[PDB]
Amino acid sequence: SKEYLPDLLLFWQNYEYWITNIGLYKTKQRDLTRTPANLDTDTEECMFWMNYLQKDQSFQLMNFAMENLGALYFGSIGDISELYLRVEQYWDRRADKNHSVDGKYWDALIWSVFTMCIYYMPVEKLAEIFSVYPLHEYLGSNKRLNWEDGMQLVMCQNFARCSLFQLKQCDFMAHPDIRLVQAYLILATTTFPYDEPLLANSLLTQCIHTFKNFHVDDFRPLLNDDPVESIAKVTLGRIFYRLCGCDYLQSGPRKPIALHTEVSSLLPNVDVYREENSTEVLYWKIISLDRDLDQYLNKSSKPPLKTLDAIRRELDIFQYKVDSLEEDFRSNNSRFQKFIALFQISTVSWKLFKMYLIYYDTADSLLKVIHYSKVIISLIVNNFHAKSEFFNRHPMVMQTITRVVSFISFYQIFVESAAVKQLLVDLTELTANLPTIFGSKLDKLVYLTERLSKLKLLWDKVQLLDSGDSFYHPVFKILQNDIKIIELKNDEMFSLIKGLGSLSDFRTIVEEFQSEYNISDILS
Amino acid sequence: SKEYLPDLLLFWQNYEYWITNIGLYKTKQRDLTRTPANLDTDTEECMFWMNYLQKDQSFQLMNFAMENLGALYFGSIGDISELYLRVEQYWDRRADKNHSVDGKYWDALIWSVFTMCIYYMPVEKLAEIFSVYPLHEYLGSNKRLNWEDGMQLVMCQNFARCSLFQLKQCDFMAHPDIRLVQAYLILATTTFPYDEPLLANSLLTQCIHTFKNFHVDDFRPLLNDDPVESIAKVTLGRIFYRLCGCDYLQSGPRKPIALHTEVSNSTEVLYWKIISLDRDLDQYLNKSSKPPLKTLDAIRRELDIFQYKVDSLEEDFRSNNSRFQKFIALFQISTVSWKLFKMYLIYYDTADSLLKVIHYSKVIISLIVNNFHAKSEFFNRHPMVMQTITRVVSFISFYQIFVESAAVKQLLVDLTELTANLPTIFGSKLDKLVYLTERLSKLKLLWDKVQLLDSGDSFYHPVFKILQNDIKIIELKNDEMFSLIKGLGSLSDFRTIVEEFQSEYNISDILS
Amino acid sequence: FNPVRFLELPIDIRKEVYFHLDGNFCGLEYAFWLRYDCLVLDCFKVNHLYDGTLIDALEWTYLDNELRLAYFNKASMLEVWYTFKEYKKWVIDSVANVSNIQFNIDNLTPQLVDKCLSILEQKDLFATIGEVQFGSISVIRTIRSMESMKSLRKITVRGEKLYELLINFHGFRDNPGKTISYIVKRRINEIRLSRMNQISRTGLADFTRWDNLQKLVLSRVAYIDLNSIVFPKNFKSLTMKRVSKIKWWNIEENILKELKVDKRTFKSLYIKEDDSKFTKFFNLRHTRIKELDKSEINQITYLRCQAIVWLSFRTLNHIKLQNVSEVFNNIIVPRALFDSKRVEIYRCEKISQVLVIGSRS
Amino acid sequence: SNVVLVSGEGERFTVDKKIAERSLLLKNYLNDMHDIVMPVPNVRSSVLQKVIEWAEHHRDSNFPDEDDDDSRKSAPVDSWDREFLKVDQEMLYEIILAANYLNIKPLLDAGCKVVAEMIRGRSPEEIRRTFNIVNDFTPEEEAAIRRENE
């Protein structure tokens, strides 16, 4: 019999929630009796990584971001030609021995902008601007590494830490101001929310508290307002919808305080149909389609087909709006905006037809999954060319492939097909050719896929037993115990007790495979 | 006509929400272009102010807390003889070079306990323990200042700041743990929520994040549980109910992330039930609506039930912890009773209301004057008597402005005499309370010397326009739109009397 | 025709087959065997499987001295009829809890409406019934029973005799038994109207009493006036079927009273520049939409124009229009409901002027 | 500039880009980056040739909308479409499967209207009196119905 498949596809939703989503990005094994305390206070380290930079290097980073990366910061900070004055003021106020809170806020904002500049610059321009040598003079690592060898990410993470250190010098908890939130919306474009998810959740809770301090709900200005007040409300609305997007991209069992009062498209105090659609709320609408799909992962109920068909209709509507974006390609900012919107709309299409395949098994759903996987392959391989390799550095290409190359692996364990194997070979070709800036995270993904490849072999050599009621095989036990182990590793009761307390060949094959390929290797 | 009295008593709800609560205690005038961003991050300050404390002095602080302060820390840390081991570990580990995060959490907890010891200690033992002279050698102030001048408040603020500095060395943002909530609830016993208000709001939002990290929503022990887990869930329930209490004691416009999901071992449950009754009373300050009579009658019936429960409580004379608990519980239930009959007087104008207000006001005065003797003077240092006496003297002065009575006048003289006799550990809040009482008395003189007029539809008097402009100025001062604009870019004889009163008796003097 | 390959055919294509096959299951009728087809049970299994977004016209009737579910055609001819245990058994077959069942008053007799309500109340449930179709003894008999009607979400009211008594706020009378009981008005999520001529005559069309409206349907009405109608808090949708000449909002008269500019000079102020990017997808071909020029206005004045547009347009998500054949006062809609596919006009060749305000950036 | 579709059997067909924009998939598979061949699996080449001929017929026809649920009900049974889909049943279902895969709403609507006219006018009391996929029907219930038939 081949009727074990629908319950196993329904088990994929639980496995995708706990292994691929939570346990790979959003779980950090902490142990408070072993972490070193912050007695350095990041003072010597960020003192070095602040006086390492020079002035001409900073203005070249600003010119690079001015002519390339505008689709990321243009909703957050606005127009960056205003910020050249702030860079001049930083390089003039660097010699001052008494700083103000406002000046240090502007300095933290431009250091976050520099962190994004370091994250999205290709290795050739970064080697022509910066020098490899004094970092190896300082960091004490191996003196043979280059920028393409894994030292660009170290400089990016240390610039993010220096932005956070300049936030620490403000007493940012005692002075709530908007330059926290904007700075986090520049730091939420790197892999900073995936490096330290605990610190990202704490800063994001501070950003939610800082935003809700202003008590602004409607960003449509009124008729009895200062013109400055109306421009302030427009910029605050753009910051708000970018903050909602960067807020949904970190959800899970460690993020309890939601900002999600934004009502999704036609199932809620902020109904998102009333704003004039700029880039930021368009990105939020695509993230809202994503969040309306991926709430049924850990839930036991099944999604209605009414909802999935509404998602299909609105998916085609925003698909056509991306075509009718209509900007000038000579400035190439619209090129990167078009890539972001097109990759997100292909991701949401893929998740829609994955849920079509799993929950209801509709007309050629697997074939549409293969088709949109090939579309994602096309949209990533097309940017293997020159001058636009860094387009493959926006973090959503790390998420979506992690959703794809797991699932097409998992289905390959149980249903043998011809197109699926060639698609898996294409994904295995694509996974190694992703940029090396995702580092260890990228490495972990390959390990997961490799484990699933080995999980095909144990499916083949072992015969499926039968009890009449339910089915029994070691693959089922191992896939169950993976979710059991990672749900055990997200239980903070033992942290509470460390706080204020005083403290059959079936089983053999399962213990052999879990002793050989442990799932806890993917935990951060 | 004489119709201004009910609408003016309804105006008192607005004035009591903004001026006596948000303006005096919960508003900090900030300026970001002039405030020194401390690049040192208080390392030079707290390094000295932690080298000032000595070991045997700290153990005498812990002994005083064990003897006399149990009804405060029992909600947060339970028993303090269990904490002596952690104090020993800190004093042995202090001489090291490296440190661990869990140790620094225990250090933040015991420094918060030290702050609670300093804030409630009487002045004679505090003078016998600590010197006065290195304080003025560091601060550069007068050598002739004493503890009653205000140096004990300065030492309390510096210990709170050094506890926060130990929290900042933990990177408590990137490492949530339950000792943050306990070390904040010990710092919530003082007037640290009134020195730095939005810093306390940020710490309380961090504590709400740290609590909801655990995902425990029901605190009852099951059968298949580890008993350690059941003890942990009971203790976490205690911390949750007291955290709801200290959350309600910091509400307002500058704190929108609230924990109040609960609606309406025996002591903490009694304490939260009294505070929740207080919450259901004072939820009608900022609102434009009015409570029904059935609501106030149910509050009165439950008030009599908890009055009998406090009458069912005991007291011990050799154990001062029991008298401290008894005074706190009886003062809380008397404050809730006074606020209930104040709402009776304001909203419905029911007979036998003002006599009940004077009755429970004299009960509050008797509970304070009973502690004016020896051996129990520090009972008046709890923040609830500052809040309660602020509301009482404000409402009695506002009632004396517009309604004359001899018993009310003698009550006002008693409140005014007791107001200057409050201890000097409240300091600037006490001075601004005296200034607000003096401003309302001069407003009474202005009400006396100026005729009330009427154009045929509504009344007109300078007192009404001044009391309205106070609320309008403080609602203008509690807006962050100007800070948002500065963040985005760098972009008749009647009127004469009103402007002279506003130019002489300014409203911005009660702010911070 | 092979009904065994048609059933192994997948779900949504078979749905699209039944989408064009709504009422006419046959084509006078041999109603004995027509119920027990596999295709009819397939229709109702798929119809229960989505939400009820197909035919959905399931009535309670008292036929053959028995209370049973019944489906009526588009011309109100009886197609199928189920005993409730049968329909429960095959809904359980589909799902491997019913709550959406319509209730006419117009397609029934009051001497059996009373018995239907009495035995339906005292028998087991008096629940699982969503819509209530009004449009006078039987009406008052139904009103007395709606207090126990736990899960209803819809009210349809037919022509103007029954509307002004029940729905509009104008009365405020002293008859509690005649009108609603204010617990049924809390869960009243949609309201449809039909078979009338004027909604706002002899008073004012005010919906302020009815809280919690997320949709509204105006069908086959002669003359309405949007300027007269006010709307509740938390109002979402607005759908209008085939109507005659109607008046729209006073938005253009408020822009004309803002800039202090004339009508003919405003007709040279409405640009028609950005009509070839995305509005070609709208497939209008009759209404050429027009916007305001960016060079002929300031920034803050344009934001104030948007603020004037959102006044008397406070909370609305989508406006749906069938053939209306005329609109008097100068359609000028916001782009935030026009740039997405929310403002949807479908069959209007007689309409010509659509103005749209907002940035298309 | 021509666009090549690929069938399931392997025969590569060639149409124009403006012709291929009748499909709501070529319009979103070719619009990746402007700085040519689309595979269609599991479609026999005759079926894709018929779909291509249908797309070449209606090059300048105004179809109603995408979300007009009442214009689909008020059905235009087009003359060339009714002449076109007059094939046997399996060819018709393969065309409808191809139109669902190619995301072409009007051909899907026309095919489903043809199948709806087939299923509407079934033989009364001949095929409707024979239920044939008999499940959730006991022999007791079937015997009860066949006893209630007389």
Residue numbers in the entry:
A (entry chain A): 54 to 320, 330 to 565, 588 to 608
B (entry chain B): 54 to 317, 339 to 565, 588 to 608
C (entry chain D): 4 to 30, 88 to 156, 164 to 202, 257 to 482
D (entry chain C): 4 to 38, 75 to 189
Please quote the authors directly.
The centromere binding factor 3 (CBF3) complex binds the third centromere DNA element in organisms with point centromeres, such as S. cerevisiae. It is an essential complex for assembly of the kinetochore in these organisms, as it facilitates genetic centromere specification and allows association of all other kinetochore components. CBF3 comprises two homodimers, of Cep3 and Ndc10, and a Ctf13-Skp1 heterodimer.
In order to identify the binding site for Ndc10 on CBF3CCΔN we assembled a complex of CBF3CCΔN bound to a monomeric construct of Ndc10 comprising domains 1 and 2 (Ndc10 D1-2). Two-dimensional classification revealed high-resolution classes in which secondary structural elements could be identified, and these data generated a 4.2 Å map. Our map of the complex between CBF3CCΔN and Ndc10 D1-2 has excellent density for the core complex and lower resolution for Ndc10, suggesting flexibility between the two. The interface on Ndc10 is mediated primarily by residues at its N terminus (before Gln 44) which are also predicted to be helical, with minor contributions from the C-terminal end of α3 (Val138) and a disordered loop between α1 and α2 (Pro65–Ser72). The C-terminal residues of Skp1 (Glu189–Arg194) are also located at the interface. Superposition of the crystal structure of DNA-bound Ndc10 D1-2 from the budding yeast Kluyveromyces lactis onto our model indicates that the DNA-binding site of Ndc10 is coplanar with, and approximately perpendicular to, the CBF3CCΔN channel.
